[PDB]
Amino acid sequence: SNLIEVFVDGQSVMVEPGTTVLQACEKVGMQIPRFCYHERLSVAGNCRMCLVEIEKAPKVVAACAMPVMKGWNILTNSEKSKKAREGVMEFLLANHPLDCPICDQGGECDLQDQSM
Amino acid sequence: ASATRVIQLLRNWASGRDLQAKLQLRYQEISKRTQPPPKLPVGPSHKLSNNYYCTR
Numbered sequence: 001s002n003l004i005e006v007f008v009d010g011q012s013v014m015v016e017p018g019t020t021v022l023q024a025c026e027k028v029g030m031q032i033p034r035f036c037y038h039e040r041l042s043v044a045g046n047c048r049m050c051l052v053e054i055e056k057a058p059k060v061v062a063a064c065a066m067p068v069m070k071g072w073n074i075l076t077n078s079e080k081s082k083k084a085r086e087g088v089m090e091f092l093l094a095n096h097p098l099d100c101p102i103c104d105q106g107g108e109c110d111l112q113d114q115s116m
Numbered sequence: 117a118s119a120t121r122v123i124q125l126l127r128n129w130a131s132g133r134d135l136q137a138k139l140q141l142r143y144q145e146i147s148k149r150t151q152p153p154p155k156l157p158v159g160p161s162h163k164l165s166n167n168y169y170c171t172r
């Protein structure tokens with residue numbers, strides 16, 4: 001068919017053209033970290049938490065908004081992607097209030113779990 | 117302890133050791149129950165840079 005071959009951590013998978021990097025990662029079986037992306041809502045690209053490294057690419061792309069093309073090898077657990085996630089969480093938590101004991105979303109917070 | 121000399125000699129002879137050298141009752145030689153504040157130094161991963169979590 002028109003399906004194209006993309007690699008996630010060296011594992012090949014067929015994806016329809018127009019599929020984002022995040023959707024390919026879900027197809028392989030991994031969940032890219034996210035804060036602003038919702039499947040039922042339009043793509044925004046604000047939180048930059050879904051930043052993932054494409055092999056042989058010097059710039060980290062946003063997996064939620066970047067359509068994937070043939071031949072890409074998505075390095076989700078690479079050092080660059082981990083450092084990008086750590087930086088994004090540090091910036092997110094720089095101005096967050098210390099309200100966890102009084103917050104109504106204590107044990108079900110995406111911020112808490114993704115920071116952990 | 118507050119023991120007379122004769123009783124001390126009797127105990128030392130009967131036991132065969134010098135009791136007053138090493139007594140089993142605690143006296144003023146113990147530390148005070150009020151102590152100065154501590155400081156408790158921080159650990160090795162308290163750097164402000166070159167401390168990314170993915171490396172440790």
Ligand code: FES
Nearest residue numbers: 037045048050064
């Ligand atoms: S999930 Fe926020 S930038 Fe993609």
